[PDB]
């Protein structure tokens, strides 16, 4: 089993919880799996609900519900990096500095990267010297319905609201939300096989 970094939010209502639900049981059934986040400050799940409650009561308590510190991690450790929708992206991940080593790091050895939905922001950190971005000539979808960066979701597509949408380009893959997060990272665990 290799390992795999799940970057999510710290941020105030931060990371969605169906896609994070699923991110998490999936990619741990594949790989040795760590949550990081900004500070490592614990997650604020949006969107809970009657039919995942009982699922992350449990992940509350369980010992790896606490992320690592972002900060803290070594690109290098991990062969695969998978974000999920995380509305909380765009104060906390959009702007990490830390999140745009580790990403340029993944790019350079074009290792696998997913990212889902509102995740998708996430991306936005990663401005080469030239502060172009890494991602210039890949094809990704995205959330355009919700702020620092508004030009890089505009120039640098989309399908229809709550349908699945997810694209394929060379080892980066992109879910466009929440509901694409299980072919999603479906398609990440075909990359890795």
């Not at 999510?8 to 741990?28: D, I, K, N, W």
């Not at 519900?65 to 909380?88: M, N, Q, T, V, W």
Request: glycine share 6%; hydrophobic share 40%.
């Amino acid at each position: 089993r290799p390992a795999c970094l799940l970057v999510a939010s710290g941020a105030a209502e931060g990371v969605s919880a169906q896609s994070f639900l699923h991110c998490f049981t999936m990619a741990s059934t594949a790989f040795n799996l760590q949550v990081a986040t900004p500070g490592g400050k614990a997650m604020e799940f949006v969107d809970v609900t009657e039919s995942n409650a009982r699922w992350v009561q449990d992940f509350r308590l369980k010992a790896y519900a606490s992320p690592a510190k972002l900060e803290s991690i070594d690109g290098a450790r991990y062969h695969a990096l998978l974000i999920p929708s995380c509305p909380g992206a765009l104060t906390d991940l959009a702007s990490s500095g830390s999140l745009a080593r580790i990403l340029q790091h993944f790019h350079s050895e074009s290792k696998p990267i997913c990212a889902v939905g509102h995740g998708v922001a996430a991306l936005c950190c990663a401005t080469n010297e030239d502060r172009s971005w890494v991602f210039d000539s890949y094809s990704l979808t995205g959330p355009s319905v919700c702020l620092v960066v508004e030009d890089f979701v505009k120039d640098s597509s989309a399908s229809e609201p709550d349908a699945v949408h997810v694209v394929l380009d060379r080892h980066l893959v992109t879910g466009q939300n929440a509901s694409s997060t299980v072919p999603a990272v479906q398609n990440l665990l075909f990359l890795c096989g």
